[PDB]
Amino acid sequence: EKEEAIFRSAEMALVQFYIPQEISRDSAYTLGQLGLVQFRDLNSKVRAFQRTFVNEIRRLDNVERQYRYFYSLLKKHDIKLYEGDTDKYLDGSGELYVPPSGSVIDDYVRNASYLEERLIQMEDATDQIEVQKNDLEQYRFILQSGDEFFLKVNYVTGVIARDKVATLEQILWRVLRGNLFFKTVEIEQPVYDVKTREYKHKNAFIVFSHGDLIIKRIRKIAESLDANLYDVDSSNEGRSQQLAKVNKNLSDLYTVLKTTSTTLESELYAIAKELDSWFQDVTREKAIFEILNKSNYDTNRKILIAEGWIPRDELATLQARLGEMIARLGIDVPSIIQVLDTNHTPPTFHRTNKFTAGFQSICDCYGIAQYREINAGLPTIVTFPFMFAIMFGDMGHGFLMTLAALSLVLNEKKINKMKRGEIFDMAFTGRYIILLMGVFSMYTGFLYNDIFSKTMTIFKSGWKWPDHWKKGESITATSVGTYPIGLDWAWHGTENALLFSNSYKMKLSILMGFIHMTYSYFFSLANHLYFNSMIDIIGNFIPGLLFMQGIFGYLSVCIVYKWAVDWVKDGKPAPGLLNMLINMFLSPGTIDDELYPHQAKVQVFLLLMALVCIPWLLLVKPLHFKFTEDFGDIMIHQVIHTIEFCLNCVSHTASYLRLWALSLAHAQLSSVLWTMTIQIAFGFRGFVGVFMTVALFAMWFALTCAVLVLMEGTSAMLHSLRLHWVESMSKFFVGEGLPYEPFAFEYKDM
Amino acid sequence: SFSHFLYYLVLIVVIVYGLYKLFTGHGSDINFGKFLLRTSPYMWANLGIALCVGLSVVGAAWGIFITGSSMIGAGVRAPRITTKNLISIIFCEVVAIYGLIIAIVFSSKLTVATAENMYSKSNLYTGYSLFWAGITVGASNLICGIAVGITGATAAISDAADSALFVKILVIEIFGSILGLLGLIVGLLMAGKASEFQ
Amino acid sequence: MEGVYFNIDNGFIEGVVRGYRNGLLSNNQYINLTQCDTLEDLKLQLSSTDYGNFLSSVSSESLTTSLIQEYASSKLYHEFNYIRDQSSGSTRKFMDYITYGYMIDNVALMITGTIHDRDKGEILQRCHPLGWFDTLPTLSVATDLESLYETVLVDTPLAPYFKNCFDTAEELDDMNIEIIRNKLYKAYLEDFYNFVTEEIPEPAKECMQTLLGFEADRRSINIALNSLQSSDIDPDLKSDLLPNIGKLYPLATFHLAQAQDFEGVRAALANVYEYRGFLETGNLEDHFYQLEMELCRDAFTQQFAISTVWAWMKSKEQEVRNITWIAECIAQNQRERINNYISVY
Amino acid sequence: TGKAWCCTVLSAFGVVILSVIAHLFNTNHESFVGSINDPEDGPAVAHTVYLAALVYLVFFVFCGFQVYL
């Protein structure tokens, strides 16, 4: 039965194919249709041009060039390429289909060569006509100008690019020593320069002079720029006669252009209806030879040897399908496939469904896991959106984001088919992430007791106010109980609210951060026991565990303990944990306020334990290796690892404060936004009160969606992502894995 | 150059003013000591806290853009570096966390002093303590952030060439990151004995 | 120090350019290239390298050594223009200064190519594209430096450099253009060196001063050797062709100006250590390219210095020369010289 | 047409949130009238808000056709 592989990579097997040459082509096609095998390159020593199937590839490469050329012409003349059905062959199903024959492929080769020789001839013949058309129409334009254009051979005239006319008159002014008489007239629309495959604005121009040498120099200057020079009679009758002569010539020319043009399009439309179908077949024919190039060829027995990785549990279907091929051909092939055992690293492969695929991508994006290593995916499914929810805590914003995600989830069958821009495709790909990202946000928003910056009075408060007071008189509440779920709503609007909630959220962030880190660190043990790497248990895991648990685990215990003791009832001074933490390092054995009996005696023990773990972590593994330049490499590696580890414990546990920081900033922004927009509307009364309420809600809601839900939300999301890549995965993730990427056919886009 | 002319002009003015007070016998008027006694201690404390987070953030921001621009430039040909080198950004960002943490610790001491006790020995001590401690943490984080950022740029551009170089050069980066942590430790020591404003 | 401010504008440039440096062909890749049987194999081998698909549009029978040179060069120029387009300020000035040298050569090519009567259509295809300026083809109009200056060149960035050209004869021939071409290079390098000394920070300043120094020395020695083909020339005229910024200046340049035979030139260089081996042994042309690559290789060891742009340009220019030399040997079926490609990496 | 979806979704929340706010005002809930800085008379502001809720309802039902057709 098929195994689920999400907790660790799927098991892989190495198989060796003995393919007799006579069915090399057919067998390669079937394996491509299965889409399971990933091949090793057995010819890695050989120069690129010496691999055995080089010339076969060259033929198909040349056809591919020609198909690229055809597609260019389709776009030049703006003809839609027809669309083939993506599913006409298969969709990862492993379904067998019959490959094209050799004669069919040779027919593609012949036809593609034939079509290029025709199109390259017809296309150029058409461009030759277009050049004459553009030339005459420019000439026609000048003749159509009024005689006042000529008022001030007596002159030189032509057409020049709009970009350069300013340079022309600058040059001519010097050449003629300021005697320049010069006129310029616009052409109202771009002119087409087919050799440049662009169109440009242009100007008609004329220059006056009598000297022969001067006229000749002016011509050479203008022709050195991209101008075209035209000859025009001085008399209005001459212009009229020449305009008529041109008009006849130009009017005739459209006949030749039209007949050639429609012939050319008739050629293209035949290709446009089938070019995609051709392209898919040729590229797949090209592809299989790129696979066969990786096999090792036994010229004596005429056998191709190919090595490939395959999932362990799907050997059965691989065996069956090649059996179907042998049955179809009717050849007594001797055991085409053989399983193998070698000291090579197999590829990493995780099976996923539509729900898990989004979360797995976020882990693979950082780096591919080592073979059979603990997958970072499963822990990420919950802890990624949840760490987000701790920051993005607000029931209103959580609800709005849930609706957005839920709509994408419900409509997914329609959204899946339509094409998407990547700014929208990422959202759809992550739809199940955002759904949990919203649901957990609603939960944490309830514990913070905050909806759109307002508290919820769901239960009886644990704080009781005085019996009486007057307007503007300061009061203090009396404790009468503990609120059952979340923050007590009595804190709302309270003048010292922040002094409480900051103590709450800061301690929350440290506790959640430490628990998250120590949890994922224990995956390190799960790797070492699986690989039977006993040396790492003694060398790395235990010393690291004692080191961090002995400092920041101890701090976590103290934080929880201080909440359990009733200090005011005992009359004892409540100790400052932060000062206590510092003093146990900088002045061990001395205490200001005791959190519990024998405080000093145990703390000095913890300090000594932490110190002893450093050399233990640093030395034991390298020494074990020497006892059995490798030792030098092992030693220099290990010492750096210790400095990273010991330093990271401080940086990482400190870095988790961002869980508090982004929550506080998010809350205070929301309350100010409410105070400045909707809170204002309640002042007004009457009709203006109605209009202001209508208007200011629209302002409030629009800003809430844009700034808070979308911008501040995504910023909170990416911070929680960084906490996973660095703070968490660095403690159990090795990486450097070879990604599983099998040989499989797909639809080429062109 | 105008700026250096201004510097010399200020220097000349200060010297001439000093000599004028000195030669006329009133040289005791300048009296830096009295200035330190009469200025309110809340000024020194708040400048210490504000510049602590302020200069620390400048350090992190300055480092990030040096590394970030290099990562984006080198990443055009080799996108693989973009995720692995995020460690370099982290080593820059963390010095802002150190500055933030000190801002939390120092904020706890800004109580309101009784008027009759305003300029007493202990209150002045806390005023000076938080000022120099804040400057120390801030400036050292500013120096650390830039040094790490420069190192990170060379690391990213090396990784794009050969992956084996990255782990070798990161050793220089962690060496750089220690400077900010030592700054934090001295900061907590300088502010250790300072009492709350009584 | 250098790294504190450099990345405010040049961070993206430095990163991308070094991406190109990581693509320079190594010696092992050259060795593989030399063992191709035909140009069609050379295309397939090059496709493995950073060059990739750059010839993918070329038919089998269209492959020729001239075409490979054109396509390999065109790849470099587009990359250069991209790097320039993404730059600003002092860096933009520096990259423009790199182009001036090429358009100076285009000017001399344009004039000589029209003193002999052949039309501009051929010449523009022989011009170097980094040296384009919109009025360049207008230089085909006349055969007189005074006319060419007043009508065209006054508008170009090259205008300041003609201060010593107008003293020449009223009629232009190959010799007179070659005098003009070198006189322009003298002022160009001396102007470029001053700009580097003033407006480029360390360590690029010291590194760039070294690279331009070698460039000036190479021109000086080449000018001296070429002058020996003439029957005689005034030493005080030769002294106006030698640039002042080099390592040879002033002592060796003075002796080079007064040299009248190969032994005189050889004696003139023998007192300068860095070049003492150049004339005694082997091909002089290759020695300069050898030293040029080593100076470029040193420049790459810096960082946060804009000199990497110069090192990348001159380095990859040599790569094209290596590719074409190998391609020619393949196309002509003669291979005894094939290993004479020159490469530091 | 796209412009209809923007208005209908916005007005949908404009009905709910405003109506709930009006109800808390009309019941003199501490979170809305508790402070000396809140408006003095719940039902008066509640009546003012209720009118705004009705306004959004008109937009909501009208745009319902625009997305439906």
Closest-CA residue of B relative to A578 is: B105
Q: Which among C18, C24, C301, C302 is the top mutation candidate for probing chain B, defined by the most B β-carbons within 10 Å of its own β-carbon?
A: C18
CB contact under 8 A, C45 and A47: yes
Enter the resolution in angstroms.
Answer: 3.4
- Residue A203, strand partner residues: A160, A186
Residues of A with CB under 8 A from a CB of D: 452, 454-455, 457, 471-472, 492-493, 681-686, 689-690, 693-694, 697-698, 701-702
Q: Which chains touch D (3 or more CB pairs under 8 A)?
A: A
The Cα–Cα gap between A629 and A634 comes to 9
Using H for helix, E for strand and C for coil, what is the string for A569-614?
Answer: HHCCCCCCHHHHHHHHHHCCCCCCCCCCCCHHHHHHHHHHHHHHHH
The Cα–Cα gap between A37 and A311 comes to 8
Distance of CA C103 to the CA centre of its chain: 11
Name the phi and psi angles at A330, rounded to 5: 80, 30
Closest-CA residue of C relative to A46 is: C32
Q: Which chains touch C (3 or more CB pairs under 8 A)?
A: A, B
The Cα–Cα gap between C250 and A473 comes to 93
> How many C-beta neighbours within 10 Å does residue D38 have?
16
Helical spans, DSSP H, in A77-184: 102-143, 165-175
CB-based contact, C134 to chain A, within 8 Å: yes
| Inter-residue contact A40 to A294 (CB < 8 Å) | yes
CATH code for residues B6-191: 1.20.120.610
The Cα–Cα gap between B47 and C286 comes to 66
Domain limits of chain B? 6-191
**DSSP 8-state symbol, C160:** G
Residues of chain C contacting B74 with CB distance shorter than 8 Å: 15-16, 18-19
Closest-CA residue of D relative to A695 is: D52
Token digits for C248? Answer: 């040879």
Whether omega before A573 lies within 30 degrees of 0, making that bond cis, reads no
Segment 178-197 of chain B within 8 Å of chain A by CB: 178, 181, 188-189, 192
Residues of A with CB under 8 A from a CB of B: 365-367, 506, 578, 582, 586, 640, 643-644, 647, 650-651, 654-655, 657-658, 661, 722, 725-726
| Inter-residue contact B80 to B30 (CB < 8 Å) | no
Count of structural domains within chain D: 1
CB contact under 8 A, C32 and A47: yes
Cα dist. A181→A155, A163, A210, A433 in Å?
A: 10, 20, 12, 74
Q: Do chains D and B touch (3 or more CB pairs under 8 A)?
A: no
CB-based contact, B84 to chain A, within 8 Å: yes
CB contact under 8 A, B100 and A661: yes
Residues 6 or more apart whose Cβ sits within 8 Å of residue D14: A694, A697, A698, A701, D52, D53, D56, D59, D60
Residues 6 or more apart whose Cβ sits within 8 Å of residue A386: A440
CB contact under 8 A, B77 and C303: no
| Inter-residue contact B74 to B157 (CB < 8 Å) | yes
Token digits for A30? Answer: 């079937």
Residues of chain A contacting B105 with CB distance shorter than 8 Å: 578
In degrees, rounded to 5, the angle at the alpha carbon of residue A685 between the alpha carbons of residues A682 and A689 is 70
Distance from CA of A282 to the nearest CA of C (A): 17
Whether omega before C250 lies within 30 degrees of 0, making that bond cis, reads yes
CB-based contact, C35 to chain B, within 8 Å: no
Token digits for A84? Answer: 């083939």
User: Experimental technique used?
Assistant: cryo-EM
DSSP strand pairing (A303-311 vs A38-39):
antiparallel
Residues 6 or more apart whose Cβ sits within 8 Å of residue C107: C136, C139, C153, C158, C181, C184
Closest-CA residue of A relative to B169 is: A640
CB contact under 8 A, A367 and B84: yes
Count helices and strands (H / E) in chain B. 7, 0
CB contact under 8 A, A47 and C141: no
CB-based contact, B188 to chain C, within 8 Å: no
Q: Do chains B and C touch (3 or more CB pairs under 8 A)?
A: yes
Name the phi and psi angles at D27, rounded to 5: -105, 10
Q: What is the DSSP string of D15-50?
A: HHHHHHHHHHHHTT-HHHH-STTS-S-HHHHHHHHH
Q: Which residues constitute the domain of residue D15?
A: 1-67
